[PDB]
Amino acid sequence: DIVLTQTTPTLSATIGQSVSISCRSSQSLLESDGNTYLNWLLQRPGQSPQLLIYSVSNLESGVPNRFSGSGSETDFTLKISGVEAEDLGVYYCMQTTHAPTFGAGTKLELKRADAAPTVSIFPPSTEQLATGGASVVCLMNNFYPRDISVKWKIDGTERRDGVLDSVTDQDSKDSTYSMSSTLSLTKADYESHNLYTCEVVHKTSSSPVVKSFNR
Amino acid sequence: VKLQESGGGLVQPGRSLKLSCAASGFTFSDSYLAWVRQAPTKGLEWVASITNSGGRFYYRDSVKGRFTISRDNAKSTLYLQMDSLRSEDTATYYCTRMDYWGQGTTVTVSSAETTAPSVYPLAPGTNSMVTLGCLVKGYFPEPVTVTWNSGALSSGVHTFPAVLQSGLYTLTSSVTVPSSTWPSQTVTCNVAHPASSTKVDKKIVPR
């Protein structure tokens, strides 16, 4: 099985900045016919993949000139000579020299000024508690960069179990991310404790952002 | 050049589904074609591929013996017969000649049955901006559409990707409004789940 390694899973670029996305093959991709069957694809959010470059360096028709490809037999590079907003998405290297494989992708996101998250904690509704369980929700909205840590504390002690997180795609207009964390508990487990805390660690502050409620 | 996939839908594990891809704008019999899948949140996998005249083909290890790629050159259509479907086969399937890709067809393989969501308010439990939300719990399959005051509140709206738990999806949707707006004026989230023919409106009332 040929392994295509895209070393960088995420890249943060500014508009007009030049970027290079690398792809490393486990074995040579030079075929017996003298051709190297390595392609580059872009997949914008909510869209199907789109071919940029085929056979290492050939630009597909209709594709802007700012995209170029180069490579040896095992090391390949897609260069974007001046990123544009339409170039944001996930880049995939792919080969057909051997049984066809793809890389895991490289997300190209937009770099913006660091933004602290707006943290909100929500107790479970009386309505849901009327069923078997309770969901405690913590929102951390409009932050940058993506890297964020959320800790749930019940009566001062950390709770790791029953926690599910979800992060939105970078916003096209403000370039920020938003994350939701849900702490799922039973009604009995929820009623057993008093203080419910959401502890948020982001690079914008040395001290974590703490949001709490009681019951 | 146009590629249009069909045949995708929801099926229980072990069941069959046949995907088709209607092609136009090119000499179909001259093109080598493939099926490329994408599991939700994941990347691309080559499923099966076939030469212009058939004769030579390829199946990735995981689909060998279960899937059958074929084409009808006279009808300009590519097919993917999928038998003994597993949860592992859940993905959007693309029909492609590499330079051209279709819009995709979604395949969901699950033992879970179509379930309408339960909608719960997210209200604060304590001159500013207030964040309110809706917890949309226990639905299947995806997607759900969430709006705020029908279309009236669009700025400050965040609808988070759904998370799977015990075969059911759960998402949160939030809205940020000025403190002078709520609870003075009504804030309602409108949840639509087309799969179960459900529309739910939940007014967010203070605690």
Partner: peptide, 12 residues
């Protein structure tokens, strides 16, 4: 050029 249509990974 787009795909190795003659690739040795094909079956028959």
């Amino acid at each position: 050029q787009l795909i190795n249509t003659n690739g040795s990974w094909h079956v028959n």
